[PDB]
A = this chain, B = another copy of it.
């Protein structure tokens, strides 16, 4: 089942009394129809943010931004694939020595690396906008629907992957922790694999800058927990990989005998 097939958050249209109640409100607003009205006090007008119309409108804005960021990554890979194909298929009439071939290859790598970093930053901008649109949906009931969770995981997953490619490891930690709190996302080993690297980066920075010992241990403890969890999720418990990790964790961690 595809949760984003219809491109909507909650379908809005049953009680006879409720239909009667809605009818009189419609007539009341007809009497006071004033498109030029602007409420001095915004408290009443801000109640619209809890409506289904606001959530549906915000959902498509976040959906559109998510799609735009996805296109940026996909087109970048397609262009890079095409670029190497065209570079290899063109003739080199002045290329006869091996060190010339090495130098040409390094030029291609710089071009490819340059465009990948440029694409990642553009895609992250769309994902960051997609995050902001979803964070202003203040209705708790609409936040638990499968459609909301489907997009929120996809937005977080793409954002974390792109932010990791930009070497922004510390900024990936808060999104990853919110990621594993949705449905059964905690059971996915890739989500725990990144947290292993993300906390390892934090641990090195505290050690490199000679930071507080309390922060050093908290990051070191968090690093092993998600590193061990990923080993269990991908290779299984009591596996040879699991046994190897425990020895590494135990040697690194502090134990009392």
Contact = CB atoms under 8 A, between A and B. Distances in A.
B78 A251 contact: yes
B68 A257 contact: no
Contacts of A255: 67, 71, 74
A74 B257 contact: yes
Nearest to A74: B257
Contacts of A257: 70-71, 74
Contacts of A68: 254
Contacts of A254: 67-68, 71
Interface in A57-93: 67-68, 70-71, 74-75, 78-79
Contacts of A74: 255, 257
A256 interface: yes
B71 A256 contact: yes
B71 A251 contact: no
Contacts of A75: 251
A254 B71 CA distance: 6
Contacts of A251: 75, 78-79
A70 B256 CA distance: 7
A255 B74 CA distance: 9
Interface in A203-257: 251, 254-257
Contacts of A79: 251
A75 B247 CA distance: 11
A67 B256 CA distance: 5
Nearest to A125: B213
A71 B256 CA distance: 6
Of listed A71, A79, A254, A255, residue having the most chain B CB within 10 A: A254
A77 to B, nearest CB: 11
A119 to B, nearest CB: 13
A244 to B, nearest CB: 14
Interface string A87-112: 00000000000000000000000000
Interface of A: 67-68, 70-71, 74-75, 78-79, 251, 254-257
13 contacts: A67-B255, A67-B256, A68-B254, A70-B256, A70-B257, A71-B254, A71-B255, A71-B256, A71-B257, A74-B255, A74-B257, A75-B251, A78-B251
Report, nearest first, the 4 A-B pairs whose CB atoms are least far apart. Answer: A67-B256, A71-B254, A68-B254, A71-B255
